Amino acid sequence: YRHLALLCDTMTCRGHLMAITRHGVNRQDTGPLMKCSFEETVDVLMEA
């Protein structure tokens, strides 16, 4: 239950549904290197 609770708590620790894509992970303030580590790499760095 630790693992299910952690996953369901990271998706809802922002108030809305954080979908696990670029569209939900790359909309929270985490870091340009962290966000470019995921699937969109150049666009995150250009915006940052």
């Binding site: 239950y1 620790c13 108030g15």
Partner: protein
């Protein structure tokens, strides 16, 4: 239909009574759960152009302490509410000295009036609710755990014990239907008690953003 309308008006009345009681108001105990037949006796069993029409059952409640503030609840006659309808309610409120109020719209609000509701928010606060939101007290649902609004002293105690800031709490939307139910504003931490199958009880906290 006419029996369906008095059932629907009674369920909206019941949910508004439970909403005011969960929000921390003076709700009379028999009013908090009356029978449908008691509502039909008190109001008149014909919402179709008759005695339990709208604006008869505008519920005025005060607070359980500091009895000055009131949110005397509104029920518009028309389905689609507009600005020239809510300014009559603004006139009834500025006749009074009280700033909170709830309107219970039937169909959706015109979005100019949605902007208009925000256009007096420091002056006097207006919340709106559709009929479908108030045919079920969503805090009675088994998926919805116990939300409790915290006072500012308890928020200072919380942040001083865990040595964290308001930026760091997990948060909640302002248009969250439970947040809309309790009517909390931005920046107002909500403790949430829920049963956990691995510890028994878990109290989380949701600052409002």
């Amino acid at each position: 239909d006419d029996e369906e309308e008095t059932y629907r008006l009674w369920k909206i009345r019941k949910t508004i009574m439970q909403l005011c009681h969960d929000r921390g108001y003076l709700v009379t105990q028999d009013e908090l759960d009356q029978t449908l037949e008691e509502f039909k006796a008190q109001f008149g069993d014909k919402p179709s152009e008759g005695r339990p029409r709208r604006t008869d059952l505008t519920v005025l409640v005060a607070h359980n302490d500091d009895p000055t503030d009131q949110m005397f609840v509104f029920f518009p006659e028309e389905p689609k509410v507009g600005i020239k309808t809510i300014k009559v309610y603004c006139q009834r409120m500025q006749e009074e000295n009280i700033t909170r109020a709830l309107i219970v719209v039937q169909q959706g609000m015109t979005p100019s009036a949605k902007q208009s509701l925000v256009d007096m928010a420091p002056k006097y606060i207006l919340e709106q609710f559709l009929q479908q939101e108030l045919l079920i007290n969503i805090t009675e649902h088994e998926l919805v755990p116990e939300h409790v609004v915290m006072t500012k002293e308890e928020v200072t105690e919380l942040l001083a014990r865990y040595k964290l800031r308001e930026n760091q709490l997990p948060r909640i939307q302002a248009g969250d239907p439970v947040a809309r139910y309790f009517g909390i504003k931005r920046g107002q931490v909500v403790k949430i008690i829920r049963p956990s199958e691995t510890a028994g009880r878990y109290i989380t906290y949701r600052l409002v953003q």
